[PDB]
Every structure is written in C-alpha cells, then in structure tokens.
Design a protein around this ligand. Structure first.
Ligand SMILES: [Mg+2]
Ligand SMILES: [Mg+2]
Lengths: 106, 106
C-alpha cells in the first residue's frame, strides 16, 4: 500500500498551523529530484518555511511538495519529492515529528 | 498546545480510505462520556466500522467522533470523546496505528 508520510505530513502541518506555529520542513537536498536554491543548503540539508504568508501556491501532494517562495526578494519555485521530506516542526518550540524511514523512498 | 491525536486520526483515516481499506476504530468504552451500544462492548472495549457506507453523518472533530450507524437494522447515534479513541486500523490487514498517551486525555 501507499506510504503514510504525506498523510502524516499534512496532518502535522494542520496541527501546527491550528496552534499558531510556523511550519518548518527539513529536507534532504541530496535526494534525487530535489529542486531548491543550492546556496541555502547546509551540509546537504535545507529548512524551508511552509507558512501561508511565506509561500505561494503551496501544494502538499502524495508525491511531492511544491511552492513559490522569495529568496532575497527573488521569487523561485521549489520542488521536493516526498522521499526527501525528513521532518516537520514548529519554528517557535521545535515540536513536531521526524518521519519514519519507508522502503519505497530509499 | 492542542493534542495531536485528532489530526493523526484523520490523517490515518484518509490514508486507509485512499488505500481501499475499511477504517476500524478501537474505543475505550469505559472512558467518561462515551455513548455506544453497551451490548457490543467486549472487555470494556468496542471496535467500530468508520467506513463511509457503514456510517451516517460521520464527524471527525478535534474533541469527538460522532455518527449514526445501524445495529441489527436499528439506527443509533454514537458519540466518542477523542480521549477514548485508542487506535485506528485496516480491517483487511491490521495496518494502522495506536495513538500515544496524551496527558490532557487522562
Ligand atoms: Mg501564501
Ligand atoms: Mg455514509
């Protein structure tokens, strides 16, 4: 059956937003297919602000996360395969979850 | 902040339905406020079919689960406080999750 990760991710995103937290996503920028600004990658990882105000056309689908965001005032489109989403947490207090490894992703 | 249980429950419910599974909910019938047919309770626990075909007016809110269902052809309304939802799983293969204890519920 399908991976649980995208469902847990959307569920946690909603919990975070409903509690007034800013949703931060930790991404493995080395994962095949990840398309993000390389200059912001630190040790092969990048943390992205997924709040409504900081993103444009946010999509949290089963296979990927996609949206527009500004980096130094320049709007850019990011594409993150679901297998590259490692965890999601509140910027304010670190509460959230790290997704469990799922065979289909590796 | 608010309990994560109702969000994980709705997320797992959707994953189950999307994978063609029949969502079964394990409930602690001894929990205060639970309103279910006592004659179906086994050892203080009751398992309920939450599929769309088997329920009427299904509500999965943050504080409770409510819906109409037939027992021996007689329609009855069930009310389950979220603190009484112990786990949710697929009737077909048992895949699902048991919710973690959360202080606010006990
Ligand atoms: Mg926006
Ligand atoms: Mg129905």
């Amino acid at each position: 059956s399908s991976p649980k990760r995208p469902y847990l991710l959307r569920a946690y995103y909603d919990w975070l937003v409903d509690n007034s937290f800013t949703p931060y996503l930790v991404v493995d920028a080395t994962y095949l297919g990840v398309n993000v600004p390389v200059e912001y990658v630190k040790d092969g990882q990048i943390v992205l602000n997924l709040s409504a105000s900081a993103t444009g056309n946010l999509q949290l689908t089963n296979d990927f996360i996609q949206f527009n965001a500004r980096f130094k005032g320049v709007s850019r489109e990011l594409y993150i395969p679901m297998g590259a989403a490692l965890a999601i947490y509140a910027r304010e207090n670190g509460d959230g979850v790290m997704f469990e490894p799922e065979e289909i992703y590796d």
